């Protein structure tokens, strides 16, 4: 019989079936800020357009003319952010109304929604946050560290309280793709350059602690190999024991000498880290210990964008073919998998009780 798997795959959609041209399925033209929408910039005739796919009604996409170089949908609402060099505009689509506009000093080269109501803007020189509340304008958070100069910016994220900020770029150095991160502390107003490829923050409440710890998790393929780090940022909430830092290996098989991490999402429902590699591997790690639960190759196709999958507290992504795919914990299998296949009853029992999962009645 087929081995039980600790994760479940699910294909949601094939974008080519909605008549999206594969030429436009890629990092610069297709954005997925949340699991609620996908926006694709396309040129049909001489007219530039955006295609907005509502994931609750995906067979009826809307197409609208644009003149923007980038389009990103709010994570929760049909509110779109558009830009053209320095010119930023926010529209409420259903109201057909321009909510907000701003012209920056410098071109915005990367931007992303970091919350329901705040957009982060990256220029060649700095990072700003722009709240949609009231008449708020963009506020500069920090100046970019020289170690990200010349990098392609691929991600920006924050902790839940927006006190720890993380900018990630990549470049080619000595024939490998090297990740450069800038971690910034809002409270200290200090940056630290870190070599890393993909990361996420997470809230985690250690047994015995009254308050959640804020954890920084990142994966890197360095010169000396793959590593995953899980570390508390900042002084522990008063009362708390500190979270002991974890550093574990990230395996790459000998035939994947050029692979590296591209995406990370953390389930706080299951306290697991999902890591996806450039050339299509999925890894699952326990957030508490860093133990590797599972690795498999989804396929040969690069998954270039991901988001949290809210329904399953998993990860949803798009690959270059336009397959929209999710991975989540298989709640009925994960505990017996850990016990029987990994032969790790210790981890199995902990996860069973920690995350209220069945299966540890036996081992």
């Amino acid at each position: 019989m087929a081995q039980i798997l600790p994760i479940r795959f699910q294909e949601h959609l094939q974008l080519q079936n909605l008549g999206i041209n594969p030429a436009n399925i890629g990092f610069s033209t297709l954005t997925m800020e949340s699991d609620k929408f996908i926006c694709i910039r396309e040129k049909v005739g001489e007219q530039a357009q955006v295609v907005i796919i509502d994931m609750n009604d995906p067979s009826n996409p809307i197409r609208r003319p644009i003149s923007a170089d980038s389009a990103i949908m709010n994570p929760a609402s049909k509110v779109i952010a558009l830009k053209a060099g320095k010119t930023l505009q926010i529209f409420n689509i259903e109201m057909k109304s321009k909510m907000k506009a701003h012209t920056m000093t410098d071109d915005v080269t990367f931007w992303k929604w970091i919350s329901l109501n705040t957009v982060a803007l990256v220029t060649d020189n700095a990072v700003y946050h722009w709240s949609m509340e009231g008449e708020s304008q963009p506020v500069k958070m920090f100046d970019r560290h020289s170690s990200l100069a010349g990098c392609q910016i691929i991600n920006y994220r924050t902790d839940a309280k927006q006190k720890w900020l993380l900018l990630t770029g990549i470049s080619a150095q000595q024939n490998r793709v090297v990740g450069a991160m800038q971690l910034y502390s809002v409270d200290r107003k200090v940056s630290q350059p870190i070599e890393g490829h993909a990361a996420s923050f997470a809230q985690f409440k250690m047994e015995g602690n009254a308050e959640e710890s804020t954890l920084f998790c990142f994966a890197v393929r360095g010169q000396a190999g793959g590593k995953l780090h899980i570390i508390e940022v900042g002084t522990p909430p008063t009362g708390n024991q500190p979270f002991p830092k974890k550093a574990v290996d990230v395996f790459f098989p000998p035939e994947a000498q050029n692979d590296f991490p591209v995406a990370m999402q953390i389930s706080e429902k299951h306290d697991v880290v999902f890591l996806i590699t450039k050339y299509g591997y999925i890894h699952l790690y326990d957030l508490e210990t860093g133990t590797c639960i599972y690795m498999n190759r989804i396929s040969g196709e690069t998954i270039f964008v991901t988001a949290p999958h809210e329904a399953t507290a998993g990860i949803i992504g798009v690959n270059r073919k336009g397959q929209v795919l999710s991975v989540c914990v298989e709640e009925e299998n994960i505990i017996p998998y850990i016990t029987n296949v990994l032969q790790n009853p210790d981890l199995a029992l902990r996860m069973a009780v920690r995350n209220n999962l069945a299966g540890a009645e036996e081992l």
């Binding site: 502390s185 630290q192 570390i231």
Partner: peptide, 6 residues
């Protein structure tokens, strides 16, 4: 720096 000690 020294935000975190890896």
């Amino acid at each position: 720096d020294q935000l975190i000690d890896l």
